C-alpha cells in the first residue's frame, strides 16, 4: 500500500493478547473486541497517529500453538476484532518486527494481531495456557462486530476504516513510510 505498509485483506498472523488498550494509537478506543496489528500493516509509526488499519474489522481463527506443537486442539473461536492500536515494530521483535526487507516475524508470520484482554476478545481466543497462536485472519465488515467507538482522544484520533470496504482501499490513510 501506500508507504510501503503491507495490507492485504486476509494472510497469515500470529497472535498474543496484551492489557490495557484505553489509550491506543489510533487514537479512539472501542468497547467491543479489538486489537493492536504489527507496525507493517498499521500504516503509521509511534507518534505519527493513526494508520489505514485503524477501525477496520477482521475476523481471526488460531490453529496452532507454536510453543506447544504437540498440541492438537482444541483451539478458541473466531472473533472479529476492530484495529485500535499499533503493535511497534521497535518493541517486541519476536512478533511485531516485520519490515519491508524482512516481512516476516520469528513465527514466519507476515502479520501479527495482539488481542486486548481487557474487553473480553482474548477470553474468546486463547484457550487456557496457549496465550501465542498462529492461524489466519480475513478482514469482515464491521456490520460483523458489536461495540461502540470511544471519544477522540487528541486531534486527528481516527477510527474511519470501520466503514470503509475492505483493503486495498484508503480511510485513514498511511502515515510516513513503513519500517525498511
Ligand atoms: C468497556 C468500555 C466502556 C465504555 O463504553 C470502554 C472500553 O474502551
Ligand atoms: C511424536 C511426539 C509426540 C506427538 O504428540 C513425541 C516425540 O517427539
Ligand atoms: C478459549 C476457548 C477454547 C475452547 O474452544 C473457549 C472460549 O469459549
Given at each position: 500500500?501506500?508507504?510501503?505498509?503491507?495490507?492485504?485483506?486476509?494472510?497469515?498472523?500470529?497472535?498474543?493478547?496484551?492489557?490495557?488498550?484505553?489509550?491506543?494509537?489510533?487514537?479512539?478506543?472501542?468497547?467491543?473486541?479489538?486489537?493492536?496489528?504489527?507496525?507493517?500493516?498499521?500504516?503509521?509509526?509511534?507518534?505519527?497517529?493513526?494508520?489505514?488499519?485503524?477501525?477496520?474489522?477482521?475476523?481471526?481463527?488460531?490453529?496452532?500453538?507454536?510453543?506447544?506443537?504437540?498440541?492438537?486442539?482444541?483451539?478458541?473461536?473466531?472473533?472479529?476484532?476492530?484495529?485500535?492500536?499499533?503493535?511497534?515494530?521497535?518493541?517486541?521483535?519476536?512478533?511485531?518486527?516485520?519490515?519491508?526487507?524482512?516481512?516476516?516475524?520469528?513465527?514466519?508470520?507476515?502479520?501479527?494481531?495482539?488481542?486486548?484482554?481487557?474487553?473480553?476478545?482474548?477470553?474468546?481466543?486463547?484457550?487456557?495456557?496457549?496465550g501465542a497462536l498462529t492461524g489466519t485472519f480475513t478482514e469482515v465488515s464491521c456490520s460483523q462486530w458489536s461495540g461502540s467507538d470511544g471519544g477522540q482522544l487528541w486531534n486527528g484520533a481516527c477510527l474511519s476504516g470501520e466503514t470503509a470496504p475492505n483493503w486495498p482501499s484508503t480511510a485513514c490513510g498511511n502515515k510516513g513510510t513503513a519500517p525498511s
Amino acid at each position: 500500500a501506500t508507504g510501503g505498509y503491507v495490507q492485504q485483506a486476509t494472510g497469515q498472523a500470529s497472535f498474543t493478547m496484551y492489557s490495557g488498550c484505553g489509550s491506543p494509537a489510533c487514537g479512539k478506543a472501542a468497547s467491543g473486541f479489538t486489537a493492536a496489528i504489527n507496525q507493517l500493516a498499521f500504516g503509521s509509526a509511534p507518534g505519527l497517529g493513526a494508520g489505514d488499519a485503524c477501525g477496520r474489522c477482521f475476523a481471526l481463527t488460531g490453529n496452532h500453538d507454536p510453543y506447544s506443537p504437540n498440541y492438537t486442539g482444541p483451539f478458541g473461536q473466531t472473533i472479529v476484532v476492530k484495529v485500535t492500536d499499533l503493535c511497534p515494530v521497535q518493541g517486541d521483535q519476536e512478533f511485531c518486527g516485520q519490515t519491508t526487507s524482512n516481512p516476516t516475524n520469528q513465527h514466519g508470520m507476515p502479520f501479527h494481531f495482539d488481542i486486548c484482554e481487557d474487553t473480553g476478545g482474548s477470553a474468546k481466543f486463547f484457550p487456557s495456557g496457549h496465550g501465542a497462536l498462529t492461524g489466519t485472519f480475513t478482514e469482515v465488515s464491521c456490520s460483523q462486530w458489536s461495540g461502540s467507538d470511544g471519544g477522540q482522544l487528541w486531534n486527528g484520533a481516527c477510527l474511519s476504516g470501520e466503514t470503509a470496504p475492505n483493503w486495498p482501499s484508503t480511510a485513514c490513510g498511511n502515515k510516513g513510510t513503513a519500517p525498511s
